[PDB]
Design a protein around this ligand. Structure first.
Ligand code: AMP
Length: 267
């Protein structure tokens, strides 16, 4: 049903690479610009790679990168929507990050929250929500990507700095652990791509977080945005906001919450 013959696409330009496989910009049927996720034949089991596609089959939303097709035979390809701007993390860290201010950044957060609100409604967990897994298109369109770890609320190792402590400690992955991650994502947005918990390693992060440590308000970030971050980081997962709440709070932000916002040098 999602199967297409491989001769239907042509891999044009290389975009990303690793021990994982490759990522290619290409054309499908000689008309549609696509993105093509290749696997290096022998780095992970055939369907552990392909599970990403199988979750992407179940989930369609305008703020989630959308699965186009799959070639099941080897070499195996996952075909998806092409995002012209690449990674949110890279975008934020690069020459385009200089000129982004709170209004653009809050709008990007609100789009990501919209995508996550859908994931919430569908009884899924993403498990890997972070700026490196948000993709940017034209006109500052942000979409959540990389559903490899996503499963239904009926892995092996997880980035302590973005993972809710109950999920890192005891494997308690809920939509509320994804809310925790979204709060971390909000610091990526307001520090322009900086790694969370500067100068702290993983082991330091865990016990700090367990003892009640939370990141401070980033410079030029309104306290009301930091307050929202800290709600996302409540110790009790059920004390954390819904994505429905986050989406609406972020959409309405400059009327309801900061009607007096004045642009600074960075935010
Ligand atoms: N669907 C896509 N459209 C455009 N660029 C992509 C797409 N998927 C991945 N990339 C790029 O290739 C890299 C590959 O890493 P990954 O996010 O695992 O696919 C990303 O960081 C992006 O820079």
């Amino acid at each position: 049903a999602w199967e297409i013959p491989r001769e239907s696409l042509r891999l044009e330009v290389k975009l990303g690479q690793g021990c994982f496989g490759e990522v290619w910009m290409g054309t499908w049927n000689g008309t549609t610009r696509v993105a093509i996720k290749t696997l290096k034949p022998g780095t992970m089991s055939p369907e552990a790679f392909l599970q990403e596609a199988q979750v992407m089959k179940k989930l369609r939303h305008e703020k989630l990168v959308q699965l186009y097709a799959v070639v099941s035979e080897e070499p195996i390809y996952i075909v998806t929507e092409y995002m012209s701007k690449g990674s949110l993390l890279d975008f934020l860290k690069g020459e385009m990050g200089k000129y982004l201010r709170l209004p653009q950044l809050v709008d990007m957060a609100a789009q990501i929250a919209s995508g996550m609100a859908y994931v919430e409604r569908m009884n899924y967990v993403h498990r890997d929500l972070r700026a490196a897994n948000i993709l940017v298109g034209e006109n500052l369109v942000c979409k959540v990507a990389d559903f490899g770890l996503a499963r239904l609320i009926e892995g092996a190792k997880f980035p302590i700095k973005w993972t809710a402590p109950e999920a890192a400690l005891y494997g308690r992955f809920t939509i509320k652990s994804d809310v925790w991650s979204f709060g971390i994502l909000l610091t990526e947005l307001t520090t322009k791509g900086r790694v969370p918990y500067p100068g702290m390693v993983n082991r330091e992060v865990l016990d700090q977080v367990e003892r009640g440590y939370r990141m401070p308000c980033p410079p030029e970030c309104p306290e009301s945005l930091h307050d929202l971050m800290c709600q996302c980081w409540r110790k009790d997962p059920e004390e954390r906001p819904t994505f429905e709440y986050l989406q609406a709070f972020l959409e309405d932000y400059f009327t309801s919450t900061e009607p007096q916002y004045q642009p600074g040098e960075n935010l």
